[PDB]
Structure formats: structure tokens, C-alpha cells
Amino acid sequence: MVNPTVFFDIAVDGEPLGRVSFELFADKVPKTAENFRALSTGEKGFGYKGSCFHRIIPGFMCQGGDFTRHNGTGGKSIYGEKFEDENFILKHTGPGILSMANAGPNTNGSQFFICTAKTEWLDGKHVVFGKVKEGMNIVEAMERFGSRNGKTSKKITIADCGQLE
């Protein structure tokens, strides 16, 4: 086994900021990790390259992945528009946890969030499937452009993304 490493190169108003890399827990959350991996490479025909982080709430999390509507309403998985919660074995234990954003039970699509804090209230409601491997400083930097209701000061995009390992 070797878990995928995927990266996002973040751009703020078109100007590249830095890279955040993630290890995806494919050995424990295989279907959720494969969905994020294939959307990072774009091998199915659509994906994250170019999408923005539409919702950033400082001290909580940074959310993105809505590559169809760019506002929290769209996105689709490689499986169909929505797929089921695979399991809840992993918890939201601290900053850097990568988890599925959803609109209730069994509504996984392509949106995801990166916790910048331990968020125990999300356990059992959002499937954790990865963690930041390097670039946590870039995540902290992204936070400064968010607001209490999640709106961003600047246009935060995924300039490029793909799979390293």
C-alpha cells in the first residue's frame, strides 16, 4: 500500500501563493479518497483545477471544491452527483484534517474543507479522508482572507493540482 499524495497550488487573485499537499487515507476510506484523487488529477474529465475556496471561516475551516456553481450549491462526484457516507472511523482531531463538506447524510459530491481547529461536533457527520502533509502555513495564510460568515476578501483559487505519489 502507498496512500496518494495530491497537491493544490493556491493562487490569490491570480497570484500564486504556495502549495498544500495532502495524504489521502485510501487504505481506510477507499471510495472517498479515490473520488478526491481523481478530481485532483482531472482524469475523469472534470475536477478541481481552477475552482475556488468559496467559504473560509477563520479559526474553523477553509471549504472549496464546488467546481460547477462556485458557491456551495454545486459539485459532483466521480460516482454521480452524490454518494453515500462511507464510514466515520476518522475524527476531526485538529488543524489540517481534510473532510467531506455535505448537505446532510449521504450527500457527498466534490466539496471538501480543511479544518484549522479540532472540531469534535463534526464527528459522525462529515467523512474524514485525509490530512495536510505540507503547506499548513499556506492554509493559515488563506484564513486571513476569510470572514465570520465565510466570505472571502480575495479570490482564492486552485491554480494547479495533481498527484505527486
Binding site: 471561516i57 474553523f60 471549504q63 450549491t73 459539485g75 463538506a101 455535505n102 448537505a103 472540531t119 461536533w121
Partner: peptide, 12 residues
Amino acid sequence: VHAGPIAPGQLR
């Protein structure tokens, strides 16, 4: 209608 985790502020 908009997806995503519920914020601390939405809870209190």
C-alpha cells in the same frame, strides 16, 4: 441548500 459544515456562529 448550500453544503458545508455548520459553523460555531451558526450554533450560537
